[PDB]
Amino acid sequence: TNLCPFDEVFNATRFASVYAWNRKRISNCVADYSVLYNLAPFFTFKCYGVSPTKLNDLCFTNVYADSFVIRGDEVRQIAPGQTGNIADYNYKLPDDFTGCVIAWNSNKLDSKVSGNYNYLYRLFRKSNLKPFERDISTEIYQAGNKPCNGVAGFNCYFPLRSYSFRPTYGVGHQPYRVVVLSFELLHAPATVCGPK
């Protein structure tokens, strides 16, 4: 039937940054959670709240698909209730989450021998992010007591740093494309079901 659009959300030309992750509603379609295992020999499929073989038996109404690129040593931070410089200022999952965080190495897709300011991450922020919140704002972070007046100087930093992605790095510094498949079920006719 109408296969869910899991082809352009996973196999895309360029993915998102950690501070500007993209949501995508996936609905009015029949999801097939089996074509994902063509993507990468190195393919983690950590799920929460749902068994990896139970998605093909339940019906949901709106399955959301986030996307961002994080370094290796930072996947673990995409988990319910876990701290870190990425899971506090860029993307935080709720403590009671129902989904499947998916990650895979992408050192061949997007890693050029130069460093490109293509993937950014938020290093400084006022407070921690609420669950499912995106802050694309780029105001000058006041790190001291004097006002910044919109100029990045002393005690006033730019709140976005750029990752360095080179193929010569170790497994703990190569880019990892991550997609968080959320599943919500409201009082509405469920459209996203399994292949029957």
């Epitope: 082809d7 352009e8 959300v9 196999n11 895309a12 030309t13 360029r14 993915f15 998102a16 940054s17 500007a20 992750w21 993209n22 995508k24 996307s67 050029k112 490109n116 300011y117 293509n118 993937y119």
Partner: antibody
Framework: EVQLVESGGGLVQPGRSLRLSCAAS????????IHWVRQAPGKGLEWVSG????????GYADSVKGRFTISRDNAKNSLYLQMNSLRAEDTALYYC???????????????????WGQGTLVTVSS | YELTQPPSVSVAPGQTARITCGGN??????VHWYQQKPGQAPVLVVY???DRPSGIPERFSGSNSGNTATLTISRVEAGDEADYYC???????????FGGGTKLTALG
């Protein structure tokens, strides 16, 4: 039909920052990559940056790396471009150009603009 | 990449004009052209060297071969005086390379 209205622009001192916006209206702001392209007064065109349908940069120029940052908001139908550390050679009419194709998954990267706007004169002087 | 165009190409409104854009090995990557009247926004003309958008007359045509892309405008008129730019992708540096456009001026 397509109305790529661009807001944000004016006189700013060398070394300060401003934020540009581009409110789209007419098409679906979830399947078309939208770029930013400048044009100095009577001095040709120049490409700044761009973002695909998923919010991801398609690259920067050879003179705006590290100083410019582009962001996309698919819910409000608006593309944003942050300009930090402006200099005297950044005075131009910044356009907001779209992409003709629908950005299918498996293809070859080739961006050609089909709908343009009017631009905002971002003058940088003392 | 780096595209180079003739700074000015003039032709009487009886014949065709020859606008070229040459680089290093621009024979395979797609070459798109743009037209910009003085004051207005750049409009689209024949792209991919083989097809034009909806509305552009059949007079506009293109051809790319090896190291030269030719935007041959047929039956040039007075209302076609504009600044024509050529575009390329250059997947090597993740950019969008334009070029110093040509000022087509109907002489006479």
């Amino acid at each position: 039909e397509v109305q790529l209205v661009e807001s944000g622009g004016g006189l700013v001192q060398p070394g300060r920052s401003l934020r540009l916006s581009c409110a789209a209206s007419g098409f679906t702001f979830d399947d078309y990559a939208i770029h930013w392209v400048r044009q100095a007064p009577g001095k040709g065109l120049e490409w700044v940056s761009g973002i695909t349908w998923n919010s991801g940069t398609i690259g920067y120029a050879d003179s705006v790396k590290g100083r410019f940052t582009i962001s996309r908001d698919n819910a409000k139908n608006s593309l944003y471009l942050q300009m930090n550390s402006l200099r005297a050679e950044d005075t131009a009419l910044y356009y907001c150009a779209k992409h003709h194709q629908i950005a299918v998954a498996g293809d070859a990267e080739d961006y050609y603009f089909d709908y343009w706007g009017q631009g905002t004169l971002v003058t940088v002087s003392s | 990449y780096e595209l180079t165009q003739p700074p000015s190409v003039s032709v009487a409104p009886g014949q065709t004009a020859r606008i070229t854009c040459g680089g290093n090995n621009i024979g395979s990557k797609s070459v798109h052209w743009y037209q910009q009247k003085p004051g207005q926004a750049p409009v689209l003309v024949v792209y991919d060297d083989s097809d034009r958008p909806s509305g552009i007359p059949e007079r506009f045509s293109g051809s790319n071969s090896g190291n030269t892309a030719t935007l041959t405008i047929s039956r040039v008129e007075a209302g076609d005086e504009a600044d024509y730019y050529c575009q390329v992708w250059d997947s090597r540096s993740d950019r969008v390379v334009f070029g110093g456009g040509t000022k087509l001026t109907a002489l006479g």
